[PDB]
Amino acid sequence: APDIPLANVKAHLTQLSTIAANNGGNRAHGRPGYKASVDYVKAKLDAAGYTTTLQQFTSGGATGYNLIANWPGGDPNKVLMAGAHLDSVSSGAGINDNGSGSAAVLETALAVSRAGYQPDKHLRFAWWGAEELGLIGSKFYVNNLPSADRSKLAGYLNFDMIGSPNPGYFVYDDDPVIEKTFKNYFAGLNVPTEIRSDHAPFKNVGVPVGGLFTGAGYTKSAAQAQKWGGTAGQAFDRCYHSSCDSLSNINDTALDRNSDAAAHAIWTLSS
């Protein structure tokens, strides 16, 4: 798998930051900052050769969208998917939650194209809307896939809040093979890992799932600061769901590591 360049990930974050600033300060469902986020991501993927689909739905009286991107090629009967919700709460720009996950998945999708990668499993990436309203977008996606298509999913990897300013390195403990893949990646860097989001709808229907997370409103412990650095007794993300979840609410090292891990997993699991 290629190394994902942190600068590129950060450049998407800067774009999302400006979009929020230009649309009232947030990128929430039913507000213009959301649609403007989808437009940016879609434009980057279309230029890269992906086939993109906008799936629209209505929730709480307003229209939301999911953006689905398929990389032409691969076994149609074995699809590996990776996703991240693209909406924020309305208090702010949602840079760490979840511009971090969204930009990492986007840069991994562009890396696929730049590398001319031809995986064995078909690759599909998704950016979910209205996660903050109760996983509405990912639930809509899953509820609307026919049984036959669902049984084609080989796995779903979720990235939600992967750049927390006082980070932990947590791996989802669901499918063991996915889980191991990520653990192994961290082991090679010599970073220890320890064991509410879009993966739920898929897990509920039997699709193997996994993912990475750097921590939210819980307090980092002494032992955790010992293993990862940062500040014990402070939340992993002091600006969770706050107006302060802006560009300076990102820890570059965590973001870079998690982005590279995502690419390593997607390469690894798609072959």
User: What residues are annotated to the active site?
Assistant: 131
Q: What share of the chain is helix, strand, coil (3-state, %, to 5)?
A: 45, 20, 35
With contacts defined by CB under 5 A, name the span among 16-24, 90-98, 211-219, 254-262 that binds Ca ion: 254-262
Residue 160 binding result from Zn ion, Ca ion, none, given CB thresholds of 5 to 8 Å by partner type = Zn ion
46 binds Ca ion (CB under 5 A): no
| Distant-in-sequence, close-in-space partners of 19: CB < 8 Å, separation ≥ 6 | 27, 33, 36, 37, 40
Show the binding pattern over residues 90-119: x = contacts Zn ion (CB under 5 A), - = does not. -------xx---------------------
* Closer CB to Zn ion, 97 or 256, in the complex: 97
The gap from C-alpha 245 to its chain's centroid, in whole angstroms, comes to 16
Does 160 participate in binding Zn ion (rule CB under 5 A)?
yes
Q: Is 76 helix (H, G, I), strand (E, B) or coil?
A: strand
Contact 232, 225 (CB under 8 A): yes
Nearer CB in complex with Zn ion: 83/119: 83
For Ca ion, which is the closer residue by CB, 8 or 52?
8
Contact flag: residue 245 with Zn ion (CB under 5 A): no
97 binds, among Ca ion, Zn ion, none (CB under 5 to 8 A by kind): Zn ion
Q: Where are the alpha helices (DSSP H) in the chain?
A: 6-22, 32-48, 101-115, 136-144, 147-150, 176-189, 199-204, 222-228, 252-269
Contact residues: Ca ion, CB under 5 A:
3-4, 256, 260
Contact residues: Zn ion, CB under 5 A:
97-98, 160
